[PDB]
Amino acid sequence: GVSTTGASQVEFGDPELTARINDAMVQVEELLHTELSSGEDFLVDIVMHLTRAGGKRFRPMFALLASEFGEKPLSENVIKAAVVVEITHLATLYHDDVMDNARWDNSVAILAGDILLAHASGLMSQLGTDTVAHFAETFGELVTGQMRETVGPRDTDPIEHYTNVIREKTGVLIASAGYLGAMHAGAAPEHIDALKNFGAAVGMIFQIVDDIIDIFSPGTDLREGVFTLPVLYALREDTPVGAELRDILTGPLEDDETVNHVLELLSQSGGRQAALDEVYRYMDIANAELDRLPDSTVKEALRNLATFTVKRVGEGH
Amino acid sequence: GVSTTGASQVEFGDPELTARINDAMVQVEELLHTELSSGEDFLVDIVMHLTRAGGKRFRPMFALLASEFGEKPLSENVIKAAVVVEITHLATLYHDDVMDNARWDNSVAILAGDILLAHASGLMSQLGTDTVAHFAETFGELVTGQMRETVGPRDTDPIEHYTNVIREKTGVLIASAGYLGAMHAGAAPEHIDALKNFGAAVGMIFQIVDDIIDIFSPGTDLREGVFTLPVLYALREDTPVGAELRDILTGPLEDDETVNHVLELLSQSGGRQAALDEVYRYMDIANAELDRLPDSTVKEALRNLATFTVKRVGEGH
């Protein structure tokens, strides 16, 4: 949501960084559009109709920033890797949307997601087997996260479940953008590893911050019966507010009245601060990863995009 | 259907061929089961529940036969390639079945197909980029065939449509099994190419022969409004039977009475022989591909499986 969107539009204080990155984003956009519009007309018509004019694409932007740490920043294979990351993101969405007349739309969305994966594999064949191995792991995790969310927490700790879902569904692909951007630019192993880990931590920050904003400002997750981190923390409390929330939150909610009452209870609970402290813990991890990288305007741009996101909910926000 | 099933069980007249191939099929089965049962328990439970105890797997068997033409037949990478082909086949089915309560089964089938593709990519990362490039093309074609079948013939020639659907949905993956089995065994380029082309031709033969059997012996395709090659040929005829079929076959059929009457008209038409002559034309292509390969019991086993299939419907069948 707003986190991943706002992140793309945090201005770099470095005008050349800005220009180089912008130029490489156009090249990503060109190659991506070529892939999305490749194949038989009847298939391409479908894929183009599902293609939602986006704006700024955070995952490829992160891959391009990560490449600034290697000897060949923004090179042709960095652009191609960024496209692979973005195509995988889109394929993922198309399969997600089908799960979240109508018999036709579902068939075609499934197939649009599949042909995107075929396009991505074509490009990966030119990037090398290490990219393919990394893709296999990343994509397997993304699929695992979607299945995990689909089956639910079952008998596990609900906060561990929530954390695992976000790490798999969201973190791993941002981590992958850092890994691939840096690796294809020929960065040092430690720097590749640091950018990967930074992307994982930032993925967590984006989603938790979004979840906090959703509740503390509509509460649309609540209506669905989707209880995110602040709600799960509040449900754990041995307080009258915790008890009343446990009584009420047995499933999705129905009238503005019950939703509104729950949102009021949540604001009376310790759930917001508990979720925020978890955000801070990931921000500490993110800063520890950036410690591994050389000082530079690109390092600080990465930091700023994390920081700016935390500041949407953080102290004196 | 019966064609691809019966093909696996045409006895090789070569007892050692039989033993070597059987041993390698066990190794395929082991590695396949390992992949299908890899990942988080909640995901593996789902994949195992969808895994339909099969029997004999034609596509990997064909890859193993094809490998008999190279310097390293049945080697570890031949086994691994055969597994990749079979996993792709299964993924394809899972996405097909969702298109051909219920909201849950669809979600999980989509995700089972996706995690299979992630497993396949893991193995391909060890097989090399040429395998990945070939996979990208093959899988893109398979997906194109499914989309083509989904959108329908639109304004194109219905027989060209039917032919394109079978070539893409079925032929390309059998062709891929021949290509990969031979390539990973280190066969000569001409032999790799011949086995690929032979697999494409055999895929056509299997499906047309199945379609003939369905009509000329229930007629279950007809009820669905699925008109296969013999029906499409009969619909083209400038005869009273062609005219009456054009009048009747405007969509799916409903009572045993109309279906039965159509099946009788089809038996009075020239549609069976026209479809059979198309089978013979692919059998000529298949024989021309085998001409490119050295004489051997494996060559004749490949021939026999084609021939045996044609003989299910062919002259004096």
Side-chain angles (χ1 to χ4, degrees), chain A residues 31-87:
Chain A
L31 175 56
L32 173 69
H33 167 72
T34 289
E35 289 285 359
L36 299 178
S37 57
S38 295
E40 296 282 347
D41 56 355
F42 57 79
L43 179 151
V44 170
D45 289 343
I46 284 145
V47 170
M48 291 286 92
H49 186 51
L50 277 169
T51 297
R52 61 178 193 189
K56 282 196 171 191
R57 307 192 180 268
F58 177 78
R59 297 165 182 78
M61 186 194 83
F62 179 47
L64 300 179
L65 295 171
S67 80
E68 289 287 355
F69 292 92
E71 315 181 36
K72 315 190 159 174
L74 312 173
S75 60
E76 166 222 14
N77 284 352
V78 172
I79 300 311
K80 191 169 303 195
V83 167
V84 166
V85 172
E86 183 73 356
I87 285 171

Short mmCIF file of all heavy atoms in Angstrom, two decimals, chain A residues 31-87:
data_model
loop_
_atom_site.label_atom_id
_atom_site.label_comp_id
_atom_site.label_asym_id
_atom_site.label_seq_id
_atom_site.Cartn_x
_atom_site.Cartn_y
_atom_site.Cartn_z
N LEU A 31 11.74 -2.75 -21.50
CA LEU A 31 11.94 -4.20 -21.64
C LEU A 31 10.75 -4.95 -21.01
O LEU A 31 10.27 -5.95 -21.55
CB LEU A 31 13.30 -4.62 -21.06
CG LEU A 31 13.57 -6.13 -21.05
CD1 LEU A 31 13.44 -6.74 -22.48
CD2 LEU A 31 14.91 -6.49 -20.43
N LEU A 32 10.27 -4.45 -19.88
CA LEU A 32 9.08 -5.01 -19.29
C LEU A 32 7.91 -4.95 -20.27
O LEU A 32 7.21 -5.95 -20.49
CB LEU A 32 8.77 -4.27 -17.98
CG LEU A 32 7.45 -4.66 -17.33
CD1 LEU A 32 7.58 -6.09 -16.79
CD2 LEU A 32 7.15 -3.66 -16.16
N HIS A 33 7.66 -3.78 -20.86
CA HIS A 33 6.52 -3.68 -21.79
C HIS A 33 6.74 -4.62 -22.97
O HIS A 33 5.80 -5.27 -23.44
CB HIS A 33 6.39 -2.23 -22.35
CG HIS A 33 5.47 -2.13 -23.52
ND1 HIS A 33 4.10 -2.25 -23.40
CD2 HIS A 33 5.72 -1.97 -24.85
CE1 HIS A 33 3.54 -2.16 -24.60
NE2 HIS A 33 4.51 -2.00 -25.49
N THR A 34 7.97 -4.72 -23.46
CA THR A 34 8.20 -5.69 -24.53
C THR A 34 7.78 -7.11 -24.11
O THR A 34 7.09 -7.81 -24.84
CB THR A 34 9.68 -5.66 -24.97
OG1 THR A 34 9.92 -4.43 -25.68
CG2 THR A 34 10.01 -6.82 -25.86
N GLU A 35 8.20 -7.54 -22.93
CA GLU A 35 7.85 -8.89 -22.47
C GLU A 35 6.34 -9.04 -22.30
O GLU A 35 5.76 -10.04 -22.73
CB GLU A 35 8.54 -9.20 -21.13
CG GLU A 35 10.03 -9.40 -21.26
CD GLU A 35 10.36 -10.77 -21.88
OE1 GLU A 35 9.44 -11.54 -22.19
OE2 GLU A 35 11.55 -11.08 -22.07
N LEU A 36 5.70 -8.08 -21.64
CA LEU A 36 4.27 -8.19 -21.39
C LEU A 36 3.49 -8.24 -22.71
O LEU A 36 2.40 -8.84 -22.79
CB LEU A 36 3.79 -7.02 -20.51
CG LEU A 36 4.43 -6.91 -19.12
CD1 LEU A 36 3.89 -5.68 -18.40
CD2 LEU A 36 4.11 -8.18 -18.33
N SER A 37 4.03 -7.60 -23.75
CA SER A 37 3.30 -7.57 -25.03
C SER A 37 3.88 -8.55 -26.05
O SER A 37 3.71 -8.36 -27.27
CB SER A 37 3.29 -6.13 -25.62
OG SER A 37 4.63 -5.65 -25.78
N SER A 38 4.56 -9.60 -25.56
CA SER A 38 5.07 -10.65 -26.44
C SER A 38 4.14 -11.88 -26.49
O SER A 38 3.57 -12.28 -25.46
CB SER A 38 6.46 -11.11 -25.98
OG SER A 38 7.40 -10.06 -26.11
N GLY A 39 3.99 -12.46 -27.67
CA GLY A 39 3.16 -13.67 -27.81
C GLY A 39 2.01 -13.44 -28.76
O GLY A 39 1.92 -12.36 -29.41
N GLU A 40 1.12 -14.42 -28.84
CA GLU A 40 0.01 -14.36 -29.80
C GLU A 40 -0.93 -13.21 -29.43
O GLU A 40 -1.16 -12.92 -28.26
CB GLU A 40 -0.77 -15.68 -29.80
CG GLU A 40 0.07 -16.86 -30.30
CD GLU A 40 0.20 -16.86 -31.81
OE1 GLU A 40 -0.54 -16.11 -32.48
OE2 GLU A 40 1.06 -17.57 -32.33
N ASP A 41 -1.48 -12.56 -30.45
CA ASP A 41 -2.37 -11.41 -30.20
C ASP A 41 -3.45 -11.66 -29.18
O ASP A 41 -3.68 -10.82 -28.29
CB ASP A 41 -2.98 -10.85 -31.51
CG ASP A 41 -3.75 -11.90 -32.35
OD1 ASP A 41 -3.80 -13.12 -32.05
OD2 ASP A 41 -4.32 -11.47 -33.38
N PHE A 42 -4.12 -12.81 -29.27
CA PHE A 42 -5.26 -13.06 -28.38
C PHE A 42 -4.81 -13.18 -26.93
O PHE A 42 -5.55 -12.87 -26.01
CB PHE A 42 -6.05 -14.34 -28.83
CG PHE A 42 -5.19 -15.59 -28.90
CD1 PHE A 42 -4.86 -16.30 -27.74
CD2 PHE A 42 -4.70 -16.04 -30.12
CE1 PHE A 42 -4.04 -17.43 -27.80
CE2 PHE A 42 -3.88 -17.18 -30.19
CZ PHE A 42 -3.56 -17.87 -29.02
N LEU A 43 -3.58 -13.64 -26.73
CA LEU A 43 -3.00 -13.69 -25.41
C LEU A 43 -2.49 -12.32 -24.95
O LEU A 43 -2.75 -11.87 -23.81
CB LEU A 43 -1.85 -14.73 -25.39
CG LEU A 43 -1.13 -14.87 -24.05
CD1 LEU A 43 -0.58 -16.27 -23.85
CD2 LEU A 43 0.02 -13.87 -24.04
N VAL A 44 -1.78 -11.63 -25.84
CA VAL A 44 -1.30 -10.29 -25.46
C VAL A 44 -2.47 -9.34 -25.12
O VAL A 44 -2.38 -8.56 -24.17
CB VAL A 44 -0.44 -9.71 -26.57
CG1 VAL A 44 -0.15 -8.25 -26.30
CG2 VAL A 44 0.86 -10.54 -26.67
N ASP A 45 -3.56 -9.41 -25.87
CA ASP A 45 -4.72 -8.54 -25.56
C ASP A 45 -5.15 -8.74 -24.13
O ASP A 45 -5.46 -7.78 -23.42
CB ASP A 45 -5.91 -8.85 -26.47
CG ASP A 45 -5.67 -8.40 -27.88
OD1 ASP A 45 -4.75 -7.58 -28.06
OD2 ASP A 45 -6.37 -8.86 -28.80
N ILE A 46 -5.16 -9.99 -23.69
CA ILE A 46 -5.54 -10.26 -22.32
C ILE A 46 -4.55 -9.71 -21.31
O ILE A 46 -4.92 -9.05 -20.33
CB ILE A 46 -5.85 -11.77 -22.11
CG1 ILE A 46 -7.23 -12.07 -22.71
CG2 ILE A 46 -5.83 -12.11 -20.65
CD1 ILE A 46 -7.36 -13.44 -23.35
N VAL A 47 -3.26 -9.93 -21.55
CA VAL A 47 -2.27 -9.45 -20.62
C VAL A 47 -2.28 -7.90 -20.54
O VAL A 47 -2.14 -7.32 -19.45
CB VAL A 47 -0.85 -9.94 -21.01
CG1 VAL A 47 0.19 -9.21 -20.17
CG2 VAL A 47 -0.73 -11.49 -20.82
N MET A 48 -2.46 -7.24 -21.67
CA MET A 48 -2.46 -5.77 -21.68
C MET A 48 -3.71 -5.22 -20.96
O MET A 48 -3.65 -4.16 -20.32
CB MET A 48 -2.42 -5.23 -23.12
CG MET A 48 -1.09 -5.45 -23.86
SD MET A 48 0.29 -4.39 -23.32
CE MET A 48 0.95 -5.41 -22.17
N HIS A 49 -4.81 -5.92 -21.06
CA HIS A 49 -5.99 -5.50 -20.36
C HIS A 49 -5.90 -5.62 -18.86
O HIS A 49 -6.58 -4.91 -18.16
CB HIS A 49 -7.25 -6.17 -20.88
CG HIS A 49 -8.50 -5.64 -20.26
ND1 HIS A 49 -8.78 -4.30 -20.20
CD2 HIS A 49 -9.52 -6.27 -19.64
CE1 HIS A 49 -9.93 -4.11 -19.58
NE2 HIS A 49 -10.40 -5.29 -19.23
N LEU A 50 -5.07 -6.52 -18.38
CA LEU A 50 -4.85 -6.71 -16.94
C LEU A 50 -3.72 -5.83 -16.44
O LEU A 50 -3.55 -5.66 -15.24
CB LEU A 50 -4.49 -8.16 -16.64
CG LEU A 50 -5.60 -9.19 -16.49
CD1 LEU A 50 -5.00 -10.59 -16.46
CD2 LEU A 50 -6.40 -8.92 -15.23
N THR A 51 -2.94 -5.28 -17.36
CA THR A 51 -1.80 -4.46 -16.98
C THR A 51 -2.30 -3.11 -16.49
O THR A 51 -2.81 -2.31 -17.28
CB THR A 51 -0.81 -4.28 -18.15
OG1 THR A 51 -0.27 -5.56 -18.51
CG2 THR A 51 0.32 -3.33 -17.77
N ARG A 52 -2.17 -2.87 -15.19
CA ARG A 52 -2.67 -1.65 -14.57
C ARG A 52 -1.61 -0.54 -14.58
O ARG A 52 -0.70 -0.54 -13.75
CB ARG A 52 -3.10 -1.94 -13.13
CG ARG A 52 -1.96 -2.45 -12.25
CD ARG A 52 -2.41 -2.68 -10.81
NE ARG A 52 -1.25 -2.86 -9.92
CZ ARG A 52 -1.33 -3.26 -8.65
NH1 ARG A 52 -2.52 -3.53 -8.10
NH2 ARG A 52 -0.22 -3.38 -7.93
N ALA A 53 -1.73 0.40 -15.52
CA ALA A 53 -0.84 1.56 -15.52
C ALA A 53 -0.48 1.87 -14.07
O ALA A 53 -1.35 2.26 -13.28
CB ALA A 53 -1.52 2.75 -16.18
N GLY A 54 0.79 1.70 -13.72
CA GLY A 54 1.21 1.77 -12.32
C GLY A 54 1.69 3.12 -11.83
O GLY A 54 1.11 3.70 -10.92
N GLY A 55 2.77 3.62 -12.43
CA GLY A 55 3.45 4.80 -11.92
C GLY A 55 4.92 4.48 -11.68
O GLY A 55 5.68 4.28 -12.63
N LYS A 56 5.32 4.40 -10.41
CA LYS A 56 6.70 4.02 -10.08
C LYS A 56 6.80 2.64 -9.41
O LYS A 56 6.07 2.33 -8.47
CB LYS A 56 7.42 5.11 -9.28
CG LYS A 56 7.89 6.27 -10.14
CD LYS A 56 8.91 7.14 -9.42
CE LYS A 56 9.51 8.16 -10.38
NZ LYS A 56 10.68 8.86 -9.79
N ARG A 57 7.70 1.82 -9.94
CA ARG A 57 7.82 0.41 -9.56
C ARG A 57 8.94 0.23 -8.53
O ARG A 57 10.13 0.26 -8.86
CB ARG A 57 8.14 -0.38 -10.82
CG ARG A 57 7.14 -0.14 -11.97
CD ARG A 57 7.32 -1.15 -13.09
NE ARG A 57 6.38 -0.91 -14.18
CZ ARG A 57 5.18 -1.49 -14.26
NH1 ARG A 57 4.78 -2.38 -13.35
NH2 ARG A 57 4.38 -1.19 -15.28
N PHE A 58 8.57 0.04 -7.27
CA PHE A 58 9.58 0.01 -6.19
C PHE A 58 10.63 -1.10 -6.32
O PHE A 58 11.83 -0.89 -6.06
CB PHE A 58 8.92 -0.11 -4.81
CG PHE A 58 9.93 -0.23 -3.71
CD1 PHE A 58 10.60 0.90 -3.27
CD2 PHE A 58 10.30 -1.46 -3.20
CE1 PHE A 58 11.58 0.81 -2.30
CE2 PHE A 58 11.30 -1.56 -2.21
CZ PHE A 58 11.93 -0.42 -1.77
N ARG A 59 10.19 -2.31 -6.68
CA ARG A 59 11.14 -3.44 -6.70
C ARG A 59 12.26 -3.27 -7.73
O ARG A 59 13.45 -3.49 -7.40
CB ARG A 59 10.40 -4.76 -6.88
CG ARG A 59 9.48 -5.03 -5.70
CD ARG A 59 8.44 -6.14 -5.97
NE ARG A 59 7.58 -6.27 -4.79
CZ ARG A 59 6.58 -5.44 -4.51
NH1 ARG A 59 6.27 -4.46 -5.35
NH2 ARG A 59 5.83 -5.63 -3.42
N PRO A 60 11.91 -2.89 -8.97
CA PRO A 60 13.04 -2.64 -9.89
C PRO A 60 13.88 -1.44 -9.46
O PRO A 60 15.10 -1.48 -9.63
CB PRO A 60 12.37 -2.41 -11.26
CG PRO A 60 10.86 -2.43 -11.02
CD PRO A 60 10.60 -2.99 -9.66
N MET A 61 13.27 -0.41 -8.89
CA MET A 61 14.05 0.74 -8.42
C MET A 61 15.06 0.31 -7.38
O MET A 61 16.22 0.74 -7.39
CB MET A 61 13.12 1.83 -7.81
CG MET A 61 13.89 3.13 -7.43
SD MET A 61 12.99 4.32 -6.35
CE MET A 61 13.31 3.58 -4.74
N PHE A 62 14.63 -0.54 -6.45
CA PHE A 62 15.54 -1.07 -5.43
C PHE A 62 16.67 -1.89 -6.05
O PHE A 62 17.82 -1.76 -5.64
CB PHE A 62 14.79 -1.90 -4.38
CG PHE A 62 15.70 -2.48 -3.31
CD1 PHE A 62 16.67 -1.69 -2.69
CD2 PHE A 62 15.63 -3.81 -2.96
CE1 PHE A 62 17.52 -2.24 -1.72
CE2 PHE A 62 16.46 -4.36 -1.97
CZ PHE A 62 17.40 -3.58 -1.36
N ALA A 63 16.37 -2.71 -7.06
CA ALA A 63 17.41 -3.47 -7.76
C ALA A 63 18.46 -2.53 -8.42
O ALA A 63 19.68 -2.80 -8.42
CB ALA A 63 16.79 -4.37 -8.85
N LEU A 64 17.96 -1.44 -9.00
CA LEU A 64 18.86 -0.46 -9.64
C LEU A 64 19.76 0.24 -8.59
O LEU A 64 20.96 0.39 -8.80
CB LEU A 64 18.07 0.60 -10.43
CG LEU A 64 17.17 0.13 -11.61
CD1 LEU A 64 16.43 1.27 -12.29
CD2 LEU A 64 17.89 -0.70 -12.64
N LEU A 65 19.16 0.66 -7.47
CA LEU A 65 19.94 1.23 -6.36
C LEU A 65 20.98 0.26 -5.85
O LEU A 65 22.15 0.63 -5.64
CB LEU A 65 19.00 1.70 -5.23
CG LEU A 65 18.08 2.86 -5.63
CD1 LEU A 65 17.04 3.14 -4.55
CD2 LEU A 65 18.95 4.10 -5.85
N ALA A 66 20.57 -1.00 -5.64
CA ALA A 66 21.51 -2.01 -5.19
C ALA A 66 22.68 -2.15 -6.16
O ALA A 66 23.80 -2.41 -5.74
CB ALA A 66 20.81 -3.40 -5.03
N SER A 67 22.41 -2.04 -7.46
CA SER A 67 23.48 -2.22 -8.45
C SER A 67 24.53 -1.10 -8.33
O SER A 67 25.66 -1.26 -8.76
CB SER A 67 22.94 -2.27 -9.89
OG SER A 67 22.65 -0.97 -10.38
N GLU A 68 24.17 0.01 -7.71
CA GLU A 68 25.12 1.13 -7.57
C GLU A 68 26.32 0.73 -6.73
O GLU A 68 27.34 1.43 -6.73
CB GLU A 68 24.44 2.37 -6.98
CG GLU A 68 23.47 3.02 -7.95
CD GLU A 68 24.20 3.78 -9.09
OE1 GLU A 68 25.44 3.87 -9.06
OE2 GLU A 68 23.54 4.31 -9.99
N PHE A 69 26.23 -0.42 -6.04
CA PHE A 69 27.33 -0.87 -5.20
C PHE A 69 28.31 -1.79 -5.91
O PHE A 69 29.27 -2.23 -5.31
CB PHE A 69 26.82 -1.53 -3.89
CG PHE A 69 26.17 -0.57 -2.95
CD1 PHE A 69 24.79 -0.36 -3.00
CD2 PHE A 69 26.92 0.16 -2.04
CE1 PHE A 69 24.15 0.52 -2.17
CE2 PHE A 69 26.30 1.08 -1.18
CZ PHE A 69 24.91 1.27 -1.24
N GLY A 70 28.08 -2.10 -7.18
CA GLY A 70 28.99 -3.02 -7.88
C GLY A 70 29.84 -2.26 -8.89
O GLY A 70 29.70 -1.05 -9.03
N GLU A 71 30.68 -2.96 -9.63
CA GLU A 71 31.52 -2.34 -10.66
C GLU A 71 30.77 -2.02 -11.95
O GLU A 71 31.24 -1.22 -12.76
CB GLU A 71 32.73 -3.23 -10.99
CG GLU A 71 33.44 -3.82 -9.78
CD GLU A 71 34.64 -4.68 -10.18
OE1 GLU A 71 35.33 -4.32 -11.16
OE2 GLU A 71 34.89 -5.71 -9.51
N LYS A 72 29.63 -2.67 -12.18
CA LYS A 72 28.87 -2.37 -13.38
C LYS A 72 27.42 -2.02 -13.06
O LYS A 72 26.51 -2.79 -13.39
CB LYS A 72 28.91 -3.56 -14.34
CG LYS A 72 30.32 -4.15 -14.50
CD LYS A 72 30.41 -5.17 -15.62
CE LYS A 72 31.86 -5.35 -16.08
NZ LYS A 72 32.01 -6.44 -17.08
N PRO A 73 27.20 -0.86 -12.42
CA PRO A 73 25.88 -0.36 -12.03
C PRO A 73 25.00 -0.14 -13.22
O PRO A 73 25.47 0.35 -14.27
CB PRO A 73 26.17 1.00 -11.39
CG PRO A 73 27.65 1.08 -11.19
CD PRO A 73 28.31 0.05 -12.07
N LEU A 74 23.73 -0.48 -13.08
CA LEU A 74 22.77 -0.13 -14.11
C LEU A 74 23.08 -0.73 -15.48
O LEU A 74 22.64 -0.23 -16.50
CB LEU A 74 22.61 1.39 -14.20
CG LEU A 74 22.42 2.07 -12.84
CD1 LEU A 74 22.44 3.60 -13.00
CD2 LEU A 74 21.09 1.60 -12.17
N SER A 75 23.84 -1.81 -15.51
CA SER A 75 24.25 -2.41 -16.78
C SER A 75 23.08 -3.18 -17.39
O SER A 75 22.00 -3.26 -16.78
CB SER A 75 25.41 -3.34 -16.54
OG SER A 75 25.01 -4.36 -15.63
N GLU A 76 23.27 -3.75 -18.57
CA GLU A 76 22.15 -4.38 -19.28
C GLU A 76 21.57 -5.56 -18.46
O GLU A 76 20.36 -5.80 -18.47
CB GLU A 76 22.62 -4.86 -20.67
CG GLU A 76 21.71 -5.83 -21.40
CD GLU A 76 22.51 -6.97 -22.07
OE1 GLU A 76 23.71 -7.15 -21.75
OE2 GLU A 76 21.94 -7.70 -22.93
N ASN A 77 22.44 -6.32 -17.79
CA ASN A 77 21.94 -7.46 -17.02
C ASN A 77 21.26 -7.06 -15.70
O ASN A 77 20.37 -7.77 -15.21
CB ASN A 77 23.04 -8.47 -16.78
CG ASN A 77 23.36 -9.31 -18.02
OD1 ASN A 77 22.66 -9.24 -19.03
ND2 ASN A 77 24.40 -10.12 -17.93
N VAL A 78 21.68 -5.93 -15.13
CA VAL A 78 20.97 -5.31 -14.00
C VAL A 78 19.55 -4.91 -14.42
O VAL A 78 18.58 -5.19 -13.70
CB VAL A 78 21.71 -4.06 -13.46
CG1 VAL A 78 20.85 -3.33 -12.42
CG2 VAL A 78 23.03 -4.43 -12.83
N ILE A 79 19.41 -4.24 -15.56
CA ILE A 79 18.09 -3.90 -16.10
C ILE A 79 17.26 -5.15 -16.32
O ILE A 79 16.07 -5.19 -15.99
CB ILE A 79 18.19 -3.20 -17.49
CG1 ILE A 79 19.00 -1.91 -17.39
CG2 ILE A 79 16.82 -2.94 -18.08
CD1 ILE A 79 18.57 -1.04 -16.32
N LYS A 80 17.86 -6.16 -16.93
CA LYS A 80 17.12 -7.39 -17.21
C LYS A 80 16.69 -8.13 -15.91
O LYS A 80 15.57 -8.67 -15.83
CB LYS A 80 18.00 -8.30 -18.08
CG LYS A 80 17.32 -9.49 -18.69
CD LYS A 80 18.22 -10.19 -19.76
CE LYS A 80 18.65 -9.24 -20.88
NZ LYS A 80 19.20 -9.97 -22.08
N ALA A 81 17.59 -8.22 -14.94
CA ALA A 81 17.22 -8.76 -13.62
C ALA A 81 16.06 -7.99 -12.96
O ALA A 81 15.17 -8.60 -12.37
CB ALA A 81 18.44 -8.84 -12.69
N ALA A 82 16.06 -6.66 -13.07
CA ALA A 82 15.01 -5.84 -12.46
C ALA A 82 13.67 -6.15 -13.12
O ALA A 82 12.62 -6.18 -12.44
CB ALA A 82 15.33 -4.33 -12.59
N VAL A 83 13.72 -6.43 -14.41
CA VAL A 83 12.52 -6.76 -15.15
C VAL A 83 12.02 -8.12 -14.68
O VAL A 83 10.82 -8.33 -14.51
CB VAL A 83 12.75 -6.73 -16.69
CG1 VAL A 83 11.56 -7.40 -17.45
CG2 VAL A 83 12.99 -5.26 -17.17
N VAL A 84 12.94 -9.06 -14.47
CA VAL A 84 12.55 -10.38 -13.99
C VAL A 84 11.85 -10.24 -12.63
O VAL A 84 10.81 -10.87 -12.40
CB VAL A 84 13.77 -11.31 -13.88
CG1 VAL A 84 13.43 -12.60 -13.04
CG2 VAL A 84 14.24 -11.73 -15.30
N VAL A 85 12.41 -9.43 -11.74
CA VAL A 85 11.78 -9.22 -10.43
C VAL A 85 10.38 -8.65 -10.61
O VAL A 85 9.41 -9.13 -9.98
CB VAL A 85 12.62 -8.32 -9.51
CG1 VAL A 85 11.84 -7.94 -8.22
CG2 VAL A 85 13.93 -9.05 -9.17
N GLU A 86 10.25 -7.63 -11.44
CA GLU A 86 8.93 -7.02 -11.61
C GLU A 86 7.89 -7.94 -12.26
O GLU A 86 6.72 -7.90 -11.89
CB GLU A 86 9.01 -5.69 -12.36
CG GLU A 86 7.66 -5.01 -12.47
CD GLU A 86 7.16 -4.40 -11.15
OE1 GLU A 86 7.80 -4.56 -10.10
OE2 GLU A 86 6.11 -3.72 -11.17
N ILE A 87 8.33 -8.75 -13.22
CA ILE A 87 7.41 -9.70 -13.88
C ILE A 87 6.93 -10.72 -12.88
O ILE A 87 5.77 -11.14 -12.89
CB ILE A 87 8.13 -10.45 -15.04
CG1 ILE A 87 8.30 -9.50 -16.26
CG2 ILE A 87 7.30 -11.68 -15.43
CD1 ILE A 87 9.22 -10.11 -17.39
#
